[PDB]
Design a protein around this motif. Structure first.
Motif: not given
Lengths: 74, 121
Positions: A23, A25, A28, B26, B47, B49, B52-53, B55-56, B94
């Motif tokens: 990924l 990071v 971003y 990604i 997830c 934390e 992640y979700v 930010l998505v 993803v």
């Protein structure tokens, strides 16, 4: 025809592989206390390549497409 | 013969696999969003934390995308069918993609359209 005793040089040479990426990071970062988008897209005037293509992170360099555009700050 | 949102979700996922799509990782995934080629966002479930979700969700909303829900991402990873190893492996996706038109342009489907209209307006 057979083994010419070539196994001592390049001891099972590994196929070219620079990095193994899960990924992204550090590339971003859209944290400006608001969550808005932050980008650094830069593109050469053409039709094949646009803002969609990704960029190699550097302290001063803009790798864009295959045209090998060189535009430096001197 | 019932109409359901999840029944259409299975159809849209399978036909997205069939028609282009299949964005694993990604990488080569933000290019579709930048060129606005894709039309769906996938959110990994349970997830570790919630950043992640979150930010998505942020990148989905700011790109003017309907907040399509996906549940049980491991089952969502089984639903593609490319797991191999019989049923072991279980690779997820993803993000989603809607290139080359999800359905046929000559004959479109209403299972996708009902969800599209319900979420857009």
């Amino acid at each position: 025809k057979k083994r010419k005793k070539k196994s001592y040089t390049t001891p099972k040479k590994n196929k070219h592989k620079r990095k193994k990426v899960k990924l992204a990071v550090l590339k971003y970062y859209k944290v400006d206390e608001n969550g808005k988008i932050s980008r650094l897209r830069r593109e050469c005037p053409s039709d094949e390549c646009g803002a969609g293509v990704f960029m190699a992170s550097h302290f001063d360099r803009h790798y864009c497409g295959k045209c090998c555009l060189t535009y430096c700050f001197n | 013969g019932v109409m359901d949102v999840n029944t259409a979700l299975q159809e849209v996922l399978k036909t997205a696999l069939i028609h282009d799509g299949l964005a694993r990782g990604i990488r080569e995934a933000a290019k579709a969003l930048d060129k606005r080629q894709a039309h769906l966002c996938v959110l990994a479930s349970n997830c570790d934390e919630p950043m992640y979700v979150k930010l998505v969700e942020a990148l989905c909303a700011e790109h003017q995308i309907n907040l399509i829900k996906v549940d049980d991402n491991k089952k969502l990873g089984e639903w593609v069918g490319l797991c191999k190893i019989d049923r072991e492996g279980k690779p997820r996706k993803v993000v989603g993609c809607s290139c080359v038109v999800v359905k046929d342009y000559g004959k479109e489907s209403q299972a996708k359209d009902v969800i599209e209209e319900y979420f857009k307006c």
